[PDB]
Amino acid sequence: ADVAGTSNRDFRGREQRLFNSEQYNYNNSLNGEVSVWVYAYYSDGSVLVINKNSQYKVGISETFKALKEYREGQHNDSYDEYEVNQSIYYPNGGDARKFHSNAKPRAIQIIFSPSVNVRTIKMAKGNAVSVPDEYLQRSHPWEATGIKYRKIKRDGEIVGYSHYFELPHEYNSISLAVSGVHKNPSSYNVGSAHNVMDVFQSCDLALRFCNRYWAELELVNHYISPNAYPYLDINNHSYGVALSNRQ
C-alpha cells in the first residue's frame, strides 16, 4: 500500500473526513434533528438544563414556578416558596419569610443546534403570571430575537447559537418559551399538505430532558462534552465539535 498521510490513496483518512462531513450535513437535512436548550443559572452555582430534540421544529415552554430551583431529595422551603410565588404574582400577595428567593434564576442561556434557522427563532419572555407584554390585550405573543444570537464557534465552524440574558434585579421574574425551526433552504414546505401529518407526529416524537447539575464545571464535563453539544461558559469560552470537512 501507499504510506499513510502521503497520497490520495489514504482511504482511512478520506473515510474519516467523510464520516464527519456526513454527520454535519445529515443534521442539516430535513431528516435531521433541531435542538434547543434552556439553562437557568441559580445563585448556588447550580444550573437547570431543559433540552428538547425534534425534527422540523422545536421549543420549550416553562412557567415562573417551573424555572425556580428544585433540589431533588432535599429540603426546598416548599411552603415558604408557595408564599414567595404569591408575592411574585402580585406585590404584597404573599406571607413569605424572605425578601429574595435564592431559587429564582440569576440568568438564562438559550442555545440552539446549528441546524436551526436563526431567523425563525421566537421567544415569549413573559411576566410571572405568563403574560408576554404587561397585559394580554396589548401582547404580541413572541419577539423574533435571532439577531441577538451569537455564533458558538470551534475551529471556525458554527456549532450552535446562544442568547444569554441575566436576571440580576429583584424585578426580573419571568415565564419563558422559545421556539426555532429547522433550516430548510428548499422550496419544499415541510408543513405543506404532503408532509403536515409528519410534523404533527414530530410534536409527539420530540424527546425532552431536564436535570439540575451542581456547577457549570459538572455541566461542561458531564452534559455538554460527552454528548458533543455546543456551549458557552461564563468566561465566554466556546465548546462543541467541528465536523464539516474535518478529521
Give the number of residues in contact with Cl ion, rule: CB under 5 A. 2
- Residue keyed to cell 408532509: 195
Interaction between residue 22 and ligand CTP (CB under 6 A) = no
Nearer to ligand CTP among residue 71 and residue 208 (C-beta): 71
Q: x/- site string to ligand CTP, residues 75 to 94, per CB under 6 A?
A: xxxxxx--x-----------
Residue numbers 20-79 binding Cl ion by CB under 5 A: 29-30
Interaction between residue 145 and its own copies (CB under 8 A) = no
- Shortest distance, CB of residue 13 to its own copies, whole angstroms? 20
Nearer to ligand ATP among residue 63 and residue 120 (C-beta): 120
Which neighbouring-strand residues pair with 179? 59, 122
Nearest to 41 by CA among 107, 133, 128: 107
CA dihedral (113, 158, 238, 41) in degrees, to 10, reads: -30
Contacted entry of Cl ion, ligand CTP, its own copies, none for residue 95, CB cut-off 5 to 8 Å set by kind: ligand CTP
Interaction between residue 73 and ligand CTP (CB under 6 A) = yes
Alpha-carbon gap, residue 77 to 103, rounded angstroms:
10
- The phi, psi pair for 197, rounded to 5°, reads -65, -30
Assess contact for 216 and 45: CB atoms under 8 A. yes
Alpha-carbon gap, residue 36 to 32, rounded angstroms:
14
Contacted entry of ligand CTP, its own copies, Cl ion, none for residue 202, CB cut-off 5 to 8 Å set by kind: its own copies
Nearer to Cl ion among residue 22 and residue 95 (C-beta): 22
Alpha-carbon gap, residue 69 to 41, rounded angstroms:
9
Question: Rule CB under 5 A: which residues touch Cl ion?
Answer: 29-30
